[PDB]
Amino acid sequence: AEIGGDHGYNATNIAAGQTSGAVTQIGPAVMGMVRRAIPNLIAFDICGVQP
Amino acid sequence: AKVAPEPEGELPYVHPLPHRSSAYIWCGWWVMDEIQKMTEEGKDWKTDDPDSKYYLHRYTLQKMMKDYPEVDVQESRNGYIIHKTALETGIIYTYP
Amino acid sequence: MNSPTGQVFALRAVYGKDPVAAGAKEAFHPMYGPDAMFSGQGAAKKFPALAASTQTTVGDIYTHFFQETGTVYLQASVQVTIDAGATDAAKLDAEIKKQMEAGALVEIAEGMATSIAELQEGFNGSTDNPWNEMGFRIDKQVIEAKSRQLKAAYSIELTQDLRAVHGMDADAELSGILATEIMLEINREVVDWINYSAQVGKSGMTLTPGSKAGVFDFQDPIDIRGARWAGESFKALLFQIDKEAVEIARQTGRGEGNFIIASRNVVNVLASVDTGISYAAQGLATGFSTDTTKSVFAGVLGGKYRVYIDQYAKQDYFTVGYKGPNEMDAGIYYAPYVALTPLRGSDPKNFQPVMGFKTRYGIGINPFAESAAQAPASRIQSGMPSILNSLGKNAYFRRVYVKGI
Amino acid sequence: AYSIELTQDLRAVHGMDADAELSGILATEIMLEINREVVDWINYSAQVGKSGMTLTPGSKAGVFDFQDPIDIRGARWAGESFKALLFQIDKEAVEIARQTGRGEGNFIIASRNVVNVLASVDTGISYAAQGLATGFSTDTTKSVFAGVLGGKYRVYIDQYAKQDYFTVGYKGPNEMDAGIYYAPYVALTPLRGSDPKNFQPVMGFKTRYGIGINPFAESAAQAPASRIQSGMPSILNSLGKNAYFRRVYVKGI
Amino acid sequence: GMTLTPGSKAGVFDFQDPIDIRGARWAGESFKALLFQIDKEAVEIARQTG
Amino acid sequence: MNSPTGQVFALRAVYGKDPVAAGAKEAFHPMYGPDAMFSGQGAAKKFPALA
Amino acid sequence: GMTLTPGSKAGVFDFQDPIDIRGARWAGESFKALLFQIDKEAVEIARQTG
């Protein structure tokens, strides 16, 4: 009566691939990476630059 | 010479205007029509009839006029800002 | 999700010489503007913080951290107190903004003196003058594929007479309703997750000083901007929805509100008013599919907001959300793994047919959902929605109840 | 000051550079801080608006709240009130020309709320209208510059607004006629190093700009003091004294 | 129920009640407020019958 | 009607293992939305009714 | 009868009564109220004469 089981829903358990069943999964796949966008600029038409 | 009974809370907001010791509230056309009708049969609008359909707004107007001596109340039929002295009589512009 | 239990990374650009630490403020925060004198005068010296009963002497600079729009550095233009009775963060921010409005506590930003800057971290025999450093954190979130299943278990004594007397099948009906119910339940689950995670709208920068802070009622003179009759009143809803779309843009940092999901009443109000910039108008609802029988998606708001209708609305509301062109910047992910794997069988004990459906989807939460926390917990965070990270915290969704319709 | 093992393993596992990421978030941070600094200098050195010649007699100085009938010229509902806001902007733009003598108001920088208000009004001369914010980029993700008002005012956005305001400014064709100068001297000079004890590399960025104030910005004095004045903004000479920028807090949006 | 204005009579639509006519005035704005009400229940049927 | 006393059938779609029962909720219903968690956690555990 | 606004004179139509002119303002709203009154009374002839 082999059971597939599942990770204990803990983030550490899924990250390590731990599974209460017989088979321990390789890893938690990949779904990309989210980086926070750089906030925008206001240009310099408001104030003269004059290098 | 009497004070208006308090109809619980939930009073409409009055915006304080320390620029001229005034304030501002948007009443509409029904409140002004009701006040004009009340001040035509010899009745009073500041405190009389504490169970009116829109007495809560009239009580708010009375409190606003007591707290601020130069209130600026805006109706909705014409959007005119009647002052405290103009609102004292209860007759706004026209009509019987 | 081709493979079960996917994961999503998230890079935090935080400063303070420690990529991971306690209370390290993120740099490129859409909510929190960067401390302008962090590389500047904030690196040469540490300014005294601004709090209750901090008598602001003339000419110096005080650091503060607002709950919204980040941290500020205020130059005291005149001596004044900060209303020592204000101890909570909200009241402290209110008092500081009051001082700002009066002009007593102005907001400035400057660089660093060249003498202090040219010698930093032990130069020319000096000491105790470190640089201001930065770094990236990179913490991950992990989701899990939850499952869902149903059974039919229809008798074989039934099908005979039911087909003989009604012409049905008793199998294409039960299987159809099972699959339809599973799909409907999954859809209702994701819709409730959108409403569950939606932030309380009309609270903060979208508030009018006199409004009710959470509901938009047409009977309030402040809420309708002193509107009259219906052409003027219903356009205040459009103005508020635009304000909350721009607030979503500020909080998320990805873009304006892309869609709204509303009740029948709010959608009907939207359709019955001229949404364009043209006087005040009203009439029968034409542009939007007000009913929820043909389809749910009911038109668009000037070609900007996709207006869906939530057919099971408790009291009333509209929820403005966000969904960028990419499938990643959504705010909540419904990632199916297996869809409706049908199973059949018949126990030899009774030979009565039995069938069932199984599916496994799992729901994930976009990192940077909170937009108010500069760092996650444990650096390996559960991606599934929960009390801690999803309830009333998704910056993407803002939900407002509309009253007085 | 990033580690070397961090670069070695992060390039292998994530595919980044571990140097262009840090250098990127350092140069971007410097530019963002400089931009916020010049914007804050503009706001802080801006004359308090709606005072003197632009003040309606029965109104507060420096505040334009939509709930004051005299403030909005006795407006009603929404279109009239926001059009009164537009009229106030025009009045301040002409006061800008009166004070500076260099030209009418040329740009405004406002909060998200004020820009959103401007985007939902028939800015031309025709009745009174409201609707969906159409003509302006109300949100600051794609860009901060949010359209133009009447083809005249380059309406920018102050995304990190504290409570609410709008500042009508000016900028002539010359970079000299500005009202305030962000005059860079060096621009993001990089610096590399490595402590020989541990060999872990350190990288940094150094800039030197300085901010100058335009003479005649006060424009209320026919002669300055000492014939040699400090050009950096300060409390004495750049606290609500520039005639090039006029700032008003808009309340009750 | 769903289509009721909170300050209304719950069963009638009289043009003399400003809450009922969305605070309208004269004739072009008061009658049009009925066109809203006739809409507010036309959708309501779609909620019930389906 | 050609013949008197006509009739019309109606097919409800109710869940709960019992097509007929005391208060068996109907699945497909315009007013009444489908229950949120019946095929999901509703089978793994039973939640307490709120009163 | 059926053409009587509950707040009118029942026999005359004066432009000065707000209920008679349905709350009209100035005269562009008021003469149109008179138009509505004559329209409403033209209908009742179809009710009575048939």
Numbering used by the authors:
A (entry chain A): 66 to 116
B (entry chain X): 281 to 376
C (entry chain B): 117 to 521
D (entry chain A): 269 to 521
E (entry chain C), G (entry chain D): 320 to 369
F (entry chain C): 117 to 167
Describing publication, verbatim:
The outer surface of the head is decorated with the highly antigenic outer capsid protein Hoc and the small outer capsid protein Soc.
The refinement of the occupancies for the two Hoc orientations using the Phenix software resulted in occupancy values of 0.4 and 0.33 for the preferred orientations 1 and 2, respectively. Since the isometric capsid reconstruction is of a higher resolution and shows stronger density for the Hoc C-terminal domain, here we describe the Hoc-gp23* structure refined against the isometric map. In this orientation, Hoc shows the most extensive interactions with the gp23* subunit D, which is related to subunit A by the 180° rotation.
